[PDB]
Every structure is written in structure tokens, then in C-alpha cells.
Amino acid sequence: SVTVHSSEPEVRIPENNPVKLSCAYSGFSSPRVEWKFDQGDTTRLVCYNNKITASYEDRVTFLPTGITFKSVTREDTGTYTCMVSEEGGNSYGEVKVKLIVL
Amino acid sequence: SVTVHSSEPEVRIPENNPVKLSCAYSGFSSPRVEWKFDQGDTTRLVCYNNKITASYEDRVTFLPTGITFKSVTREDTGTYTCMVSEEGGNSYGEVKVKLIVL
Amino acid sequence: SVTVHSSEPEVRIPENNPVKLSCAYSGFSSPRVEWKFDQGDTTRLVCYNNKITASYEDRVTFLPTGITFKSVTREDTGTYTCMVSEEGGNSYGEVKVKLIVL
Amino acid sequence: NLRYPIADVSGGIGMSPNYRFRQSMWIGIVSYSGSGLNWRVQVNSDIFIVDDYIHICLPAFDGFSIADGGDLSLNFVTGLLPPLLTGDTEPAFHNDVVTYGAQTVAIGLSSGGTPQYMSKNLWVEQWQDGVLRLRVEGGGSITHSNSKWPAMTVSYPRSF
Amino acid sequence: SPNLRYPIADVSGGIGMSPNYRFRQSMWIGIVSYSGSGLNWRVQVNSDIFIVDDYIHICLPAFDGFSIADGGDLSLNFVTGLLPPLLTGDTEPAFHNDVVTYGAQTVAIGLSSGGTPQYMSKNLWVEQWQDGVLRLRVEGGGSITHSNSKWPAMTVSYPRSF
Amino acid sequence: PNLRYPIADVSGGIGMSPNYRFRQSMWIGIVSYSGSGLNWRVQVNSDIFIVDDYIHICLPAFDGFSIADGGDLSLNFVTGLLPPLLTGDTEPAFHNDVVTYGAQTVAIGLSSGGTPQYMSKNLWVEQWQDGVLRLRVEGGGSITHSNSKWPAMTVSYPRSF
């Protein structure tokens, strides 16, 4: 049984400031972390395979404990879902973090 | 090598009775068993990969020591061949059982 | 880490005589040796996978220390390149020998 | 303490060559069907098992009328050369219906004549009781009595 | 076993090969989108997905579309439509996001203006995968004027990232 | 040590060598058509991927001249491969036997300068000998022409080990 939860299930930070969404996971050996941004009707890929996508590469860095932004904007207010799958897909974890930019 | 023989190389059982065709094999670790029915000049698949086929699933069960019928009819009189191949195909065994429905 | 060099980096032998181009390698466990003949612009395969090709099989034998000719002619003057790759291609060695049939 | 495909390779723990490359042959019957049209052809094809895949190299062959939508069936119940078993041609997805390996394949159609080639769609549809059924449809059609088929190689994950 | 690294794992006691590595079946119900020479349109589709060893196969069913240019891009959006446990990241090629011409194959497409379809033999291949969106190049085979296009079932494969 | 490739040491534990799983390279060599007296060659740049026990050669699209109904397309791997690739690495598992492996349909445009007409032809890996892979290319049907446009084709087959 693997564990994947978040310490800060709901962040609220002022515009143009740095912020880290923490996804702390345990119980994996060969895990693949993946984050997806959610702004209502649209989903966007932020990070996949412990690697940040191109559309974000310039202002979001990865870490096994969460992704952190160089600076945020209202544009990024939404529900970020962090998914951690093991190798083989027999171990799966997931947790959503809610971001609110001001 | 490996051994694949039969204790009952020839069965003779009255219609509508259950009957088991015994194929006893030894010398395999990851074997795949397969049976083929033979009535004259038409070959039919009974069991493959230690799994009974669809056309027989409803009245024939599998066992590492042979397949057994819920009930037989003259329709099934013929030469059933049991083949046991190892994984990789370096070990191969085979024996024929003749069924006669009285 | 692996070593592939030659003791006789330039051979000079009279026509119709036997000659051995030596390629001494060390550092490999499951190596695949390969020789290529070079006459200006035309490249030809001499040996591949510790096995002499067809077009040469009748007058060139293989050896872990180099290929030897039954008899040579000026047709064979050129730069013979010996390549030694490991299994997986992580270990690669190479050395060229220049033959001059006088 | 080694379970195939992991096995002993020259003293050390390696990979069984039978897993990597296994070559065979099938000399059986390919049978077309659909819209009442039926016919069969005996054929000689090579069979390669590489890793978890199985490849059936069907050579080119001639046939008769074919409907717009039809099924081509290879009967593996017979024709396989020892030590191959019909059960060795079972897909990893067992007998579910799929649309695996969908590919385009040109067939020449003639009335005895000068063949006119149709680009048709073909794929592994379903394997049941040793009989592999490929769906062959699309590409439009014309009236004909003869059909020329190309060499086709059919592949798919193999059951273990 | 503690000292075993996938795909090598514990099978029936012995050191064996993980079945999840050998065969892993899934599905995608997403959006395929054509584009090129100003022509744009999308289609919702249901395709099976098989992962065999180090390859990944996407069995696209046949589907219908609109006008298409001589040279175009067909994009599968894997950001959504995948079946748990599958992750969009799992659809990433071994050659990551470089541009390639992998799996080049011929594929016939029927083009019509409502009436009877005329089939074109076009060239298609895996071009590049970026941010969960697989883009296949589809060009060649000449063209004619049309408003509708019928596509065949196509299976797309390529080395999968690990 | 006690491990035989493709089984190797992966971060302390017994794993699978990544070189076995994915190995990428390139070939910049000569493809040569032939058959019915027609002869011509073309220099090309193709990627090469080795995945597991397979080898894929991604031939880009290219232009050529006249072609017979039945012909042979030969990739000369004796040269053009990029280190550490060896011509011997291109040898099929079935060594140099003659086969009909990877048979596929491939459309080729034929023209006489002007507009191209595409033929659906049959192509497959026929035989590999002395570093030269020969693919058979026949059927379709055909017609008069002086130029031929080829599509990007990926050729695959079990690789020798």
C-alpha cells in the first residue's frame, strides 16, 4: 500500500510571488510523477515523468516533493492534480491541490 | 528429457456418461497443454494453453492430468491427441488417446 | 576503459605471400570483431561478428588477434580498419592497419 | 530459481534465446468470407516469434470474388510445424475483439483480365479456437471474379 | 524481491520478467485533430492501447473527417482520455520529444464530396510527441478537391519511454 | 560477472540493460534500386532505432528514376553507420536466409517530369548478405515513367545477437 497526500491541500498566495505545490509520496521505488492543471473546462499538462512540460519549462521547476513556480498570475488559479504511478501500474496514488492567486 | 504418456491409451464408455482422458506429464516447469480432437479427416481444437476452447468450455473441464467430459455422445468418438510443450519449445511431449463411445 | 590497438600499424609484404594484420584487444567479455578494407573510396567488408565474409572466405581466416591471408596481391593494398564493439555498444574500440603489397 | 524468459545463459543469468528468436512455419488454410462469398487457399508462410510478438509472413496468393466487408481466417488448428502448438498463436489479449495492427493493403481485382488495384484496410480482429480472423474492408469495390493478394506480414502480442 | 529492478521481478518464486512489462492493455477516448493549410477539425475516438515490452501501440479505429491539405498534421491529445492507471506521461516516446520519421507507413484515405469516395495512398508517420500530444505527419499521395474524408483503422506504434 | 546481457546491473539491483531497451543511431549510406536492367542509387540519411530484439531503419522519402515491375532495393550498411554501430549489428536474427519478412504496402509516385501517378506496391525484407540489406519491391501494377517518388518507409526485423 503506497501513500500519496499533500500537506497544503489549498494554497492562497498574492500575484507575482513564488509558490510550491507539495505532493509528498511514499511507498514507491520506480515512480513517475505527473501534474495536470485544471481551470474549469480545460486541462493542461504541467509535468509528466518527473519532467516539466515545454509550455511550462521556463517558469516551473520539478521536485519529488512538488512543483514550484518562479512567479504566478491569476492565469494559474485552479485545481492541480498530482498523480504518482509506480512501474507496472499496480501501485497508484493521487491528490489534488487547489491554488488561488490574488 | 521430459515424459508425456497416458495410462488409459484407449477408453470405451457408454453414451451419455462422463469420461476423463488422462495425459500425465512430467519434466516440465512452464508447460502449455493442448488437446486436439480427430474424427477422420477433420481436426478440432479442444484445449490450448491449459485452457479449454469456447466450442467445448460448456462440457469439458481442464486438469494438468487430463480433460474430463460432463457427458459424451458418439459425436466424440475419435483420436484425441494431447501435446505438452515447454516454454521455448526445447521440451516437447505428446500422446494420443482413442475414445470409443459404446 | 577497453583497449584496442595494433602492434603492426603498417605492413609491407611482397605479392603472393601470406600476411597477418594484427588487432589485439582487451577489456571485452562478449566482443564482436569487424574488419573493413579501404581502397581510396571503395569500402568492402572483410570480417563481421568474428566471422569472415563470403567474398573473402576462401582466402582469409579469422582470429581474435587479427585476420590472416593465404596469399595477397596488389589488389589488396589499402587501409584495413578493425573495429571491436562490446555487447550493448557501451564499449567500443578501433584501430587502422595500412597494407602495402610490394 | 529462474523463471523464463529469464534463464541461464553460459553460467550467468541471461535471457533465453528461444524468447528472443524462435522461427517456424505454417502450411494451412486461409479462408475468405463475407456477403455470401466463400473460398479457401492453402498457403506456406514463415512464422517468427520475437520477444512477446509473433509474426506470420503470409506470402502473396490468388483468390476469387471478395465483398466490400469481409473476414480472412487463418486456421492454425493445423499446419503448424513441431514443436509449435496452435495455442502458441493465441494473442496476449486472448480472444477479445480488437482492431490491432490495422494497416493498408492493396489487392488486385480482375475478371481474369488486367488487374485493378484497391487499397483496402486490414487488421487483426479476433483469435478464437486456433482460428485467427482478420477483418478486410474499405477501399471501395468493383465487379470481379478474381483477386490477387500481396505478401502480408501479420503481427500481434503473443500470449504467455 | 528487494534487489530486483523492473522489468526484472519476482515471478512464481523465481527471478522472472514482470507480466506488466510483457503485456499491458488500456484505452484512450480522446480527440484526434487534423490541421494544415488552414484546414482544422477534430474527432472524438475510442482506441485500444497495448504496451508490449518497450513498445506502445495505439489502435485507432476508422473514422470520418473533413477536407485535408496535401501536407498536414494529425494530433492525438493524450492529456485526456487515458484510462487509470495510465498517465499521459506513459505515452512518451523513448526518443522523448525529438522530431522523427518513425513508423512511416502507407495509408489510404477516401475523399468525397458527398457522393462516391476516391481513395488516396498517403504517407504517414510518428513525427513528434510534445506535452502529451502525439503529432503524426500525413502527406503525399497527390490530392483532389473534396469536403469529406474517410479514414482507415490505423495502429500507431513506437518505442516507449522508461 | 554472474550476469549475461541483456540482463545487467541497474542501480545496485538486477535489471535490464537500457542499451537493450533503446539504442539510437543513424545511417548515411546508399540505397540502390535494380531489376530488369534498371539501375540507380541515392544517398540518404535515416535514423536507426534498436528496441529490444528489433531494429528499425527509418528511411526518409526520396526521389528516383525508372523502376521495373519487380525489383530489389538495397541498403548498403557496409558504410554510413555511426559509431559505435557495426555493419554486423544490422544482421537479422535469421541471419542471411531469404525471407518475406515485414511485407507491407507502399505507394510510389511515377511521373515523366509532369504530374505523378501513385502505384500501390508490395515491399518486404528479402535477404541480408555481407552488410547489404535487400528489400524486394514488386506488384502494383505499373506504367511508363522516367522518375519515381518514394515515401518515408520504416523497415524493421528481428536483429541478430
Numbering used by the authors:
A (entry chain I), B (entry chain H), C (entry chain G): 28 to 129
D (entry chain B): 295 to 454
E (entry chain C): 293 to 454
F (entry chain A): 294 to 454
Q: What did the original publication write about this model?
A:
Junctional adhesion molecule-A (JAM-A) is an IgSF member that mediates cell-cell contacts and serves as a receptor for mammalian orthoreovirus (reovirus) and feline calicivirus. At the virion fivefold symmetry axes, the trimeric attachment protein, σ1, extends from pentameric turrets formed by the λ2 protein. The σ1 molecule is about 480 Å in length and composed of a filamentous N-terminal tail and a globular C-terminal head. The σ1 head binds to JAM-A.
To define the structural basis of σ1-JAM-A interactions, we crystallized a complex of the head domain of T3D σ1 and the D1 domain of human JAM-A (hJAM-A) and determined its structure at 3.4 Å resolution. A T3D σ1 fragment comprising the head domain and one β-spiral of the tail (σ1H; residues 293–455) and the D1 domain of hJAM-A (D1; residues 28–129) were purified using glutathione S-transferase (GST)-affinity purification. The crystallographic asymmetric unit consists of two σ1H trimers, each bound to three D1 monomers. The crystallized complex consists of a σ1H trimer ligated by three D1 monomers. When viewed along the three-fold non-crystallographic symmetry axis, its overall structure resembles a three-bladed propeller, with σ1H forming the hub and D1 forming the blades. Each D1 monomer interacts with one σ1H monomer, making extensive contacts that shield a combined area (the sum of contact areas on both proteins) of 1622 Å2 from solvent. D1 residues involved in contact formation are located at the most membrane-distal (top) part of the domain and on the face that mediates homodimer formation. Reovirus σ1H engages JAM-A D1 using two main contact areas: a larger region centered at the D–E loop and its 310 helix, just below the β-barrel, and a smaller region formed by the top of the β-spiral and the α-helix. Contacts are largely polar, featuring numerous hydrogen bonds and two salt bridges. Instead, extensive hydrophobic interactions with substantial surface complementarity are found, indicating that this area also plays an important role in defining specificity and providing high affinity.
